[PDB]
Subunit: 195 residues, 4 copies
Amino acid sequence: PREYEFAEKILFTEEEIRTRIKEVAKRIADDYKGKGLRPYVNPLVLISVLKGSFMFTADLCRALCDFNVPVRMEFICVSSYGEGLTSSGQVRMLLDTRHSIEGHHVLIVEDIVDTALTLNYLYHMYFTRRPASLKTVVLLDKREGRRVPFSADYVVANIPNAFVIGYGLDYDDTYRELRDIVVLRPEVYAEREAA
Amino acid sequence: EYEFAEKILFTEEEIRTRIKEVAKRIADDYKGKGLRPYVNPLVLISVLKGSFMFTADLCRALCDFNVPVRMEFICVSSYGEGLTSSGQVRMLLDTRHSIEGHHVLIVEDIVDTALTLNYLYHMYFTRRPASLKTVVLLDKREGRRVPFSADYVVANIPNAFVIGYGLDYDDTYRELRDIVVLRPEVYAE
Amino acid sequence: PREYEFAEKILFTEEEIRTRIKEVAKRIADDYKGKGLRPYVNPLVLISVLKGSFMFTADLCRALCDFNVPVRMEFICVSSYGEGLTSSGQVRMLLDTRHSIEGHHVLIVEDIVDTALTLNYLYHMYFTRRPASLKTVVLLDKREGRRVPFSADYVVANIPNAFVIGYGLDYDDTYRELRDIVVLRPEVYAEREAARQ
Amino acid sequence: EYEFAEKILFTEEEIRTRIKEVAKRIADDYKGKGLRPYVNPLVLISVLKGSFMFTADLCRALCDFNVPVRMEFICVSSYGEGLTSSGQVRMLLDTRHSIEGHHVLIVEDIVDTALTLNYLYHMYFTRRPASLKTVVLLDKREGRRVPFSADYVVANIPNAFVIGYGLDYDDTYRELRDIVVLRPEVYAEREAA
């Protein structure tokens, strides 16, 4: 009984999404129980990629806190070199991390991986900085869309190819604030591209 | 329950209750203003790092009230002065879209001195939004060194090591669901 | 002499430009001899706006050194929000200064001022940071084009409205490396606007 | 003449002579490559701060040899170590255009350990330029902690406090026309402050 005129259907309710986030966080806590994480000196660093991941991250890190996984939050932001071309997957860095990741355990946090061109690019970039470990967690995975092989370590949910909006995800910087992940109506998409 | 914490100021639930009230208050203030998606959203300029969690919950609460928003994130850092009287900060990351002619709400985590907030407000004003307001998670009014009234306040506090819900000590404890008071012992160590 | 197929004419040779840079610098030295400038503690801070000013700045600060004016270089960079053009003059900050300007003597260095919408925006921004003083120097002044009143304190040269290129100035990020400031042929402009289609 | 300087390593004029030589060498290396303005320029990624003055002169000299260029500037800063083995740095400002498919020349002021330069090279490489070289103003090869050869070098130096021509000490002396050696006394006195 959350309803949206602009959406064909709902894919994931807030609650479904929170349940999966809890499951992903449990797994993470488990995979890192061996690594002796500690606040200040050795937290799991969450490199959250803006804007899309801002919501996922806010929910994810509280779920992580529930499993006593201590975390350091970093926020980066990158922008497309508006080509369409790019097989390097290259993006423009607009905000890089405040602290060194070297020797720390890092988790890159992203909202959507389809092509993985950009995630792969950012994985490689942060890998060459010699963190103790480096893994990826993604809100949505659209494996159908890969142009470079890449497996996220953690996945909240899989999706097919559609205009996916909400829960931080946007169409034209709109609809990020929805509590649910929903499928944008093609008519709404078409009407907005005319404008 | 938290070993490093003197006490719990606000539980997650209290916090979400206040945020819903603030959200309703905003929805009421902007109903005359004709907000519309794409063309006229309320722009939230969320100041990193401390406001990230507040902003995630706040924009969802605003969505419950059919307030269409646009999310922008900016990031500033301190110049290594003991303390500055202009409230100047270094711009690391700035809005993606122009704010000219839009309704803008700046979202901050904590306001004490307001020097920084006043500087940002003034900067954002000269950019000619249709209107500008600020919402803050925690107001420490005791602390002001410049005159500044937040339009929306989630909760007032005294002076204290306040951590949790996005707020840090040495980039630690931002992940907590509650806002809590640090032990001075843990601070000293 | 240098020659260029893509240019209607030369407006300023390298040597013409260096002479005016020297004259400007002498003036700056003279205006600040009273202010007790000193290296490390109290230099004249040059806020150089990229990309356009890079070459101007490199030449200007050597000239300033010739008149014993100690300087600190800062480089900022900003980008247009893709509004055709806006009345606030607002731009996006991509790179801000490394050190505080509070209490320092600051000179903002720009390549071209026409509307002054953006330079006014940047003057105001740095002014509210409370430097000891804040002035502007511009390579080229197109006073004809103002949409906000604004007077640069120092001007290397005035120009009329033309595609001005060279000496750091670009068309489509091309021709910045020229030693001279020249006028781009409208035919070349038209050929290039069609081409990215 | 400069009171704060033991000696002059290179005069402005010597520097311009070397830069002209390096520029010729580049113009020769890329003649087979079909550089053209707008569509296929040699992209100079000039690293701020210290390379600003070199970059200004170098691109003018390159223009003398009809080498079409695109100027990009990047700016990075140190993470709070003494130093680091990955040679990582923090990205503050990045290129405006993509470097995919272009010929790229990275322009640096000074290479000692090469850790930073090695990291930038590698990052830029993964961006798939058609080709990638580096040109440096001063090479301090004695100091390498990772193997790296600059393709173009304006001048080699020993180990010294080197200042001028864009190179600084505590963000001072970048404006000098010559490259000069700092007096250690001047160094000690300022460290005090």
